[PDB]
Subunit: 132 residues, 4 copies
């Protein structure tokens, strides 16, 4: 008996009345709430979410420019071992900023890894396929 | 967050050196080993398999085609779950339970290609 | 070689401002607009849609009686060779009334045949799987 | 009406009695027979297959043994792969080779017994 199966799934999210789309993901088994931002490339974590994930903020090195302001400027790049939104994605790029971030952001780099990603007016539709 | 998913699967079984195909199924949550018989229609269960499944052999009524009692199996899972599947239990000795065409035909895809039996299915997921 | 494939698909429909869900199907190659009615069984076609599909209303025998909101109506049973809504369904039961009907109805007998059918927060979601 | 669909498919190949796996692929619409070689990375095309694909053998540049690198616009094996790396050997080649670079792109790839099983999912 050789057995193989694929899970083909969808997640549909209705636009919030505030005009944004939000999505809950499990990042290293921890539920984190993201705002979808098509202007973001990698994930942007709030300091509070980074700490929930067990990052030591004092050890991070802040080398990744994420703002055009002088002064407060660089975020610390991180890699997220596991991000589960329907399927599991591995080693996802992110950074942690400096504390002005109200809510963590999910950007195009992760979104573009879904088989399908569409924003159609008031809906966001994600289609995926995972082995097993 | 609305979420939905479908499992799309395949089961591939290599022909046994004895010339037959065998498949393990979970029938009402019990693992049962079937021999595939394309000449069979419904499932033929051995008495011992029937008893594992909780059938009381003394209550079954055994008519002809030697004699068999018709039964219905609540659940047969082979990749996906099939419900209320027809079978019978014979009073004569049956060496191994038989899986026939009535169940096999229900798969989205079913092919015997020389020495392989290939079953394709799609099931909703919870 | 062995090759086998399945098309796994979804249709998502937003609730009309009038409170109903509508779906366009291709019935014997002809686009028909249906209202979804979970309180219907077989398809109910308007006289005009039946005529679009080439039914001769004078040849139909109105042998059936449906118990509606307005009570008892006469109908002629029909079979629709092909109904495509994502996948193709074959020999689908329907009937045509004598005139009580503003828009054709798609009911539970067809909707139950989809792998998935869900109505959630002003959205109707149909999931299907078709061989090849 | 938002509509989306995915084609989910499998290809199963029985080991040839000669010990190898062979796979037919459509390369720029042309059916080409490949031997699977887990030791290969990119595709290796014979000169004859290259010609079937309309490559002019006199224009190829044999760089780096040397081979001539090429890019295949379309390789279909169940699903379509685009701009796949290959080369044409000058040293002889009996049968074109499909290697790990292309095989790894499949959702599932398994050599089980005397079977090779490829599972894919393609957006539509
Ligand atoms: Cl990423
Ligand atoms: Cl979009
Ligand atoms: Cl995916
Ligand atoms: Cl049990
Ligand atoms: Cl027996
Ligand atoms: Cl049955
Ligand atoms: Cl199935
Ligand atoms: Cl509207
Ligand atoms: Cl179909
Ligand atoms: Cl029906
Ligand atoms: Cl379906
Ligand atoms: Cl794939
Ligand atoms: Na028996
Ligand atoms: Na016995
Ligand atoms: Na060569």
């Amino acid at each position: 008996m050789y057995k193989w199966s694929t899970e083909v799934g969808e997640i549909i999210i209705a636009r919030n009345r505030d005009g944004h789309f939000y999505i809950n993901a499990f990042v290293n088994n921890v539920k984190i709430k993201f705002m979808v931002d098509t202007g973001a490339s990698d994930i942007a974590l709030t300091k509070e979410d980074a700490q929930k994930l067990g990052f030591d903020l004092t050890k991070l090195k802040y080398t990744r420019t994420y703002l055009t302001a002088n002064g407060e400027n660089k975020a610390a790049p991180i890699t997220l071992n596991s991000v589960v939104i329907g399927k599991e994605f591995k080693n996802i790029k992110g950074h942690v900023g400096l504390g002005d971030l109200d809510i963590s952001l999910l950007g195009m780099s992760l979104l573009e890894r879904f088989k399908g990603f569409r924003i159609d007016k008031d809906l966001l539709i994600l289609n995926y396929a995972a082995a097993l």
